[PDB]
Design an enzyme around this catalytic site. Structure first.
Site, PDB file in Angstrom:
ATOM      1  CD  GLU A   1     -51.176 -26.754 -69.078  1.00 35.15           C
ATOM      2  OE1 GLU A   1     -52.131 -27.292 -68.162  1.00 35.15           O
ATOM      3  OE2 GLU A   1     -50.579 -25.966 -69.408  1.00 35.15           O
TER       4      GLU A   1
ATOM      5  CG  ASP B   1     -55.152 -23.315 -62.522  1.00 35.24           C
ATOM      6  OD1 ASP B   1     -55.235 -22.227 -61.596  1.00 35.24           O
ATOM      7  OD2 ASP B   1     -55.010 -23.013 -63.862  1.00 35.24           O
TER       8      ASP B   1
END
Ligand SMILES: O=[N+]([O-])c1ccccc1
Length: 175
Positions: A22, A31
């Site tokens: 992440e 993202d």
């Protein structure tokens, strides 16, 4: 494997694993799917309104952040999110038996997958779950590689898939 190499599995755990997949960002960013995110993969909202994401952030952190948090705050939110994923697995009648059948490293891959996709998304992978329970690792990995989760954002998912295949930490070595 050197002495150092044999120590590597003791340095890896679910927190180090997700931290690699992440990344760590102290400011709101989008993202790979374009969703507003912060910290260590904390999805703030799926709405395209930055104001909604900031609102979620202040709620999540408990102060006026204006889109920015500290490392310590990122870590706390991360530990809440990991706990949520673990709790989501253990209370689910479909996921729990599969999780329980898994070795320690594949259990981390399971928590990771749930952290990323949510409980209902993962629990919907009927074939993959059966394959994992039956220790059909190669088939499970091939089937995960068909998923939108992986294919829409391969870099965030590829190491998890390899980990399901092998039950080792090799994909997290040599960053
Ligand atoms: O909870 N699980 O057994 C599980 C979760 C995600 C992916 C595969 C298995």
């Amino acid at each position: 494997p050197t002495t150092e190499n044999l120590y590597f599995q003791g340095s890896m755990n679910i927190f180090e694993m997700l931290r690699i997949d992440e990344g760590l960002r102290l400011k709101i960013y989008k993202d790979c799917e374009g969703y507003y995110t912060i910290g260590i993969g904390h999805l703030l909202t799926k709405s395209p309104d930055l104001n909604a994401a900031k609102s979620e952030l202040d709620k999540a952190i408990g102060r006026n952040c204006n889109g920015v948090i500290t490392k310590d705050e990122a870590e706390k939110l991360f530990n809440q999110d990991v706990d949520a994923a673990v709790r989501g697995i253990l209370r689910n009648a479909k996921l729990k038996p599969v999780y329980d059948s898994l070795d320690a490293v594949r259990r981390c891959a399971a928590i990771n997958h749930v952290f990323q996709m949510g409980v209902t998304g993962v629990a919907g992978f009927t074939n993959v779950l059966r394959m994992l329970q039956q220790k059909r690792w190669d088939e499970a990995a091939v089937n995960l590689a068909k998923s939108r989760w992986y294919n829409q954002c391969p870099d965030r998912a590829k190491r998890v898939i390899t980990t399901f295949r092998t039950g080792t930490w090799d994909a997290y070595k040599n960053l």
